Amino acid sequence: MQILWKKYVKENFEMNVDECGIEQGIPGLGYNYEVLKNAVIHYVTKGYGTFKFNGKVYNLKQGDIFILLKGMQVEYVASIDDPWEYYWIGFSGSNANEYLNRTSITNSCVANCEENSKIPQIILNMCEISKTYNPSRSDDILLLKELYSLLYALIEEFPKPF
Amino acid sequence: MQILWKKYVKENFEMNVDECGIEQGIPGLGYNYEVLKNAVIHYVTKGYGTFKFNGKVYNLKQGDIFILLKGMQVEYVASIDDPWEYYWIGFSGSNANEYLNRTSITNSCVANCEENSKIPQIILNMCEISKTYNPSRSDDILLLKELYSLLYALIEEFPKPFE
Numbered sequence: 001m002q003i004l005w006k007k008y009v010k011e012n013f014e015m016n017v018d019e020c021g022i023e024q025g026i027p028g029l030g031y032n033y034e035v036l037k038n039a040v041i042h043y044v045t046k047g048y049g050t051f052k053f054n055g056k057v058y059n060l061k062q063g064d065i066f067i068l069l070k071g072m073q074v075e076y077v078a079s080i081d082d083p084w085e086y087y088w089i090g091f092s093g094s095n096a097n098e099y100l101n102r103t104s105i106t107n108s109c110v111a112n113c114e115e116n117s118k119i120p121q122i123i124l125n126m127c128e129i130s131k132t133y134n135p136s137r138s139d140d141i142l143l144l145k146e147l148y149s150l151l152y153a154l155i156e157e158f159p160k161p162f
Numbered sequence: 163m164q165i166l167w168k169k170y171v172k173e174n175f176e177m178n179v180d181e182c183g184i185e186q187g188i189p190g191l192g193y194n195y196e197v198l199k200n201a202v203i204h205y206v207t208k209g210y211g212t213f214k215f216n217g218k219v220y221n222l223k224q225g226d227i228f229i230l231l232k233g234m235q236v237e238y239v240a241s242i243d244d245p246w247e248y249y250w251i252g253f254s255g256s257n258a259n260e261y262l263n264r265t266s267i268t269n270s271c272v273a274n275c276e277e278n279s280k281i282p283q284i285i286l287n288m289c290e291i292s293k294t295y296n297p298s299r300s301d302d303i304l305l306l307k308e309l310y311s312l313l314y315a316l317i318e319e320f321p322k323p324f325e
């Protein structure tokens with residue numbers, strides 16, 4: 001089960017950080033469900049797993065990304081021999097959804113980032129903020145700044161044609 | 163008329179970049195008016211000028227910041243001898259105003275940043291983006307990222323005492 005799962009209030013409608021999490025997968029455990037949340041990006045930090053959507057089964061490993069979007073019927077499962085760990089960021093809002101439409105990643109909902117990608121670092125930085133989250137110290141501003149950085153980095157690394 | 167004056171559409175209501183500008187003052191000249199815009203932060207990059215608000219007269223120079231807020235009756239004028247250049251960023255939105263009210267400088271509306279302040283660099287970066295603004299290249303995302311960075315840096319350097 002998950003070592004970290006932070007849920008935030010839905011207070012913003014243009015851009016909102018909904019949740020984040022870290023899960024070390026267990027062999028023989030996966031999830032099979034219709035996505036209820038707006039958008040959830042997963043980054044694979046260790047091991048191996050499968051992501052299945054619309055009859056396509058992807059074998060993913062460290063460096064891979066998969067994104068869940070509202071209404072998708074998905075199945076994602078840790079490998080038996082070497083189960084993955086993933087980090088995730090769930091987010092919503094009218095700006096978020098417009099920016100997701102500017103990246104090719106929402107075509108297949110899977111990507112592989114380069115070893116020098118800013119995407120992993122932003123997700124990890126957002127998770128660190130989540131651990132000691134304090135809006136009185138304006139951690140709410142920092143999280144939203146990082147979410148804008150994350151969506152910019154997805155468009156930069158996985159652009160749609162101009 | 164100005165080195166830069168980019169005006170943006172009011173498309174966001176929580177956080178919006180309204181405008182960006184760079185102006186080289188003409189000696190002895192400036193502006194005297196009631197502020198109509200939501201919030202406009204100015205950073206003095208060169209020279210000297212005067213900012214007058216609510217019976218106070220500030221003699222500002224490079225490193226100084228002044229902020230214009232809706233309803234303020236202001237006058238700001240370049241010095242006769244060595245007229246200032248300033249950069250500005252106008253912004254609006256419900257969350258923008260909440261964040262601005264976590265700073266100590268919404269009454270005085272004038273500050274001096276430390277020489278290692280992130281504030282000057284963010285404003286400069288926003289002006290550079292504004293010069294070749296292209297939403298097709300997602301410059302709109304970059305400007306909002308920088309506005310969050312700017313409000314975070316203002317709160318870090320000018321924190322309202324929290325209880």
Ligand SMILES: OC[C@H]1O[C@@H](O[C@H]2[C@H](O)[C@@H](O)[C@H](O)O[C@@H]2CO)[C@H](O)[C@@H](O)[C@H]1O
Nearest residue numbers: 002021023031032033036037040088090
């Ligand atoms: O949201 C990412 C998170 O999803 C969990 O699965 C949940 C999902 O969050 C929830 O909306 C739905 O009702 O039930 C699912 C459990 O079946 C995963 O457990 C977690 O690892 C992340 O992938």
Ligand SMILES: OC[C@H]1O[C@@H](O[C@H]2[C@H](O)[C@@H](O)[C@H](O)O[C@@H]2CO)[C@H](O)[C@@H](O)[C@H]1O
Nearest residue numbers: 183185193194195197198199202250252
């Ligand atoms: O907004 C900062 C910008 O203000 C200009 O002054 C304008 C102002 O923007 C406008 O709202 C008002 O109706 O007219 C003013 C001119 O009287 C300054 O010219 C410019 O240098 C910036 O300070």
Ligand SMILES: [Cl-]
Nearest residue numbers: 229271272273
């Ligand atoms: Cl100020």
Ligand SMILES: [Hg+2]
Nearest residue numbers: 106107108109
């Ligand atoms: Hg897809």
Ligand SMILES: [Hg+2]
Nearest residue numbers: 063113114117
């Ligand atoms: Hg990667």
Ligand SMILES: [Hg+2]
Nearest residue numbers: 020126127130
């Ligand atoms: Hg987070």
Ligand SMILES: [Hg+2]
Nearest residue numbers: 020021088127
């Ligand atoms: Hg995270």
Ligand SMILES: [Hg+2]
Nearest residue numbers: 020021127130
């Ligand atoms: Hg997290």
Ligand SMILES: [Hg+2]
Nearest residue numbers: 181182288292
């Ligand atoms: Hg700008």
Ligand SMILES: [Hg+2]
Nearest residue numbers: 268269270271
């Ligand atoms: Hg003021």
Ligand SMILES: [Hg+2]
Nearest residue numbers: 225275276279
């Ligand atoms: Hg300064």
Ligand SMILES: [Hg+2]
Nearest residue numbers: 182183288289
């Ligand atoms: Hg600017």
